[PDB]
């Protein structure tokens, strides 16, 4: 399976398990604002199926980060006459696997699992991205569950009176606490206080960018567990959301999803042996081809559509020729210079600009010139 470059994506347009996995590649990119190799290093294994293991350099603690899964879903019923909802069987099945790992765990661990919360009895379909953290201390013996939420509170001109919270739920906390209680019913562990940390002042049905917030919280919870520090979030350690999810964070995310072409084997490698994934030139070709496909489609000033499909076609041909063995005709290089202005216009430009920066060239000509064979 492959995580394509989705050239038109932006953070307000939502998350899914595949792209949240793709963003995991930035955890060992020293160039990225999400870099963790300072804070932790890879572990072996220590087999927690479906999770990546990490050992902190600074202290004793073990961090397990679960790979996103489209079945990590909890549904809650807004109507409080109904039952609290459902937790999908797979999410339940790794509350049980965490608890069995902890039953033999001998060093303290934190478990990080990104999942999706949704209201089922409301006709409207809304998905909301949240983060489950379970930390276990081998001497308590406590699992403390926490949910990080990027859309809740400051409540007031629009809260529920403690009457109406008896009538309506806004959260899967009731059924998720039940799931965790049932998962440790087997064991001897005492269950710590279930808390939900709601940050980023107030948002709508929109997640719509909470995928990006919970990815960011993932990096914050690994960093803070490695250094033995409280987790800091908006409204509790960070001034406002833009302190937390800064503009550099947003673009590290947007460039990863928009412009790279990663196979899941590459990401698994990247976090099972703690290494960066250098951008290769084939990705550039693929990114162009899917900017081409998606720009054929619409809108059916500026450069015409036929102008930029003729642009990217010729530039893909060049990059293919450049790729193997092979080298590029001088006749074809003149065609490209008269297309260079079109390649760098309007988002297609940011695509070209991204790859040029990640393959070490100042421009198209400087990228392709060492490659040209003049006659003669």
Residue with tokens 């006459």: 81
Separation of CA 6 from chain center: 14
Handedness of CA 295, 301, 304, 308 (dihedral sign): negative
Alpha-carbon distances of 210 from 13, 108, 123, 127, 268, rounded to whole Å = 10, 29, 22, 10, 24
Contact between 370 and 330 under an 8 Å Cβ cutoff? The reply is no
Paired tokens of 151: 């859309």
Q: Where are the alpha helices (DSSP H) in the chain?
A: 17-23, 89-104, 173-183, 210-227, 241-244, 247-259, 264-272, 281-296, 305-323, 330-337, 340-343, 348-358, 364-368
Residue 142 pairs in a beta bridge with: 137, 190
Cα–Cα dist 106/104, whole Å? 6
Taking each helix axis from N to C end, the angle separating 348-358 and 305-323, rounded to the nearest 10 degrees, works out to 20
271, burial (CB in 10 Å: exposed 0-12, middle 13-18, buried 19+)? buried
> Coil, strand or helix: which one is 274?
coil
358 Rama sector, left if φ>0, alpha if ψ -120 to 50, beta otherwise: alpha
Residue 141 preceded by cis peptide, ω within 30:
yes
Residue 186 preceded by cis peptide, ω within 30:
no
Cα–Cα dist 339/305, whole Å? 13
Alpha-carbon distances of 320 from 267, 281, 367, rounded to whole Å = 25, 9, 14
> Coil, strand or helix: which one is 155?
coil
Torsion of CA 220, 225, 226, 229, to 10 degrees: 90
Cα–Cα dist 55/48, whole Å? 13
Q: What DSSP character marks residue 240?
A: S
Total Cβ atoms within 10 A of residue 260: 23
Q: What is the CA radius of gyration of the chain?
A: 24
The technique by which this structure was obtained is: X-ray
Closest by Cα among 132, 110, 130 to 54:
110
Closest by Cα among 270, 218, 230, 222 to 62:
222
Closest by Cα among 138, 145, 162 to 87:
145
């Amino acid at each position: 399976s492959i995580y394509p470059p989705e050239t038109s994506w932006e953070v307000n347009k939502g998350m899914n398990s595949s792209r949240l996995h793709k963003l995991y590649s930035l955890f060992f990119d020293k160039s990225s604002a999400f870099y963790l190799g300072d804070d932790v290093s890879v572990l072996e294994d220590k087999p927690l199926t479906g999770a990546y293991g990490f050992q902190s350099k600074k202290n004793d603690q073990q961090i397990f980060l679960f790979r996103p899964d489209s079945d990590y879903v909890a549904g809650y019923h807004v109507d409080a006459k109904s039952d609290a909802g459902w937790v999908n069987d797979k999410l339940d099945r790794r509350l049980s696997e965490i608890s069995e790992f902890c039953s033999k765990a001998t060093q303290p661990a934190t478990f990080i699992l990104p999942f999706v919360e949704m209201p089922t009895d409301i006709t409207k379909g809304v998905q909301h991205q949240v983060l489950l953290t379970i930390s276990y201390d081998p001497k308590s013996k406590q699992l403390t569950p926490t949910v990080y939420d990027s859309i809740g509170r400051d409540t007031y001109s629009e809260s529920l009176s403690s009457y109406f919270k008896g009538k309506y739920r806004t959260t899967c906390d009731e059924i998720l606490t039940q799931s965790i209680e049932k998962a440790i019913k087997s064991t001897d562990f005492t269950l710590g206080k279930f808390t939900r940390a709601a940050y980023n002042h107030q948002n709508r049905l929109t997640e719509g960018n909470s995928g990006s917030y919970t990815f960011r919280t993932i990096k914050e919870v690994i960093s803070s567990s490695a250094q033995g520090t409280e987790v800091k979030i908006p409204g509790s350690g960070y001034i406002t959301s833009n302190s937390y999810l800064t503009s550099q964070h947003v673009q590290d995310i947007e460039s990863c999803i928009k412009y790279r072409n990663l196979g899941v084997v590459d990401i698994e490698s990247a976090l099972t042996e703690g290494k960066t994934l250098p951008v290769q030139l084939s990705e550039f070709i693929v990114a162009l081809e899917d900017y081409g496909k998606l720009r054929s489609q619409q809108s059916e000033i500026g450069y015409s559509k036929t102008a930029k499909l003729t642009a990217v076609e010729l530039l893909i041909g060049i990059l293919n020729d450049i790729k193997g063995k092979n080298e590029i005709s001088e006749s074809q290089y003149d065609k490209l210079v008269k297309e260079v202005d079109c390649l760098m216009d309007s988002s297609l430009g940011k695509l070209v600009q991204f790859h040029l920066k990640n393959l070490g060239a100042e421009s198209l000509q400087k990228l392709v010139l060492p490659c040209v064979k003049f006659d003669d």
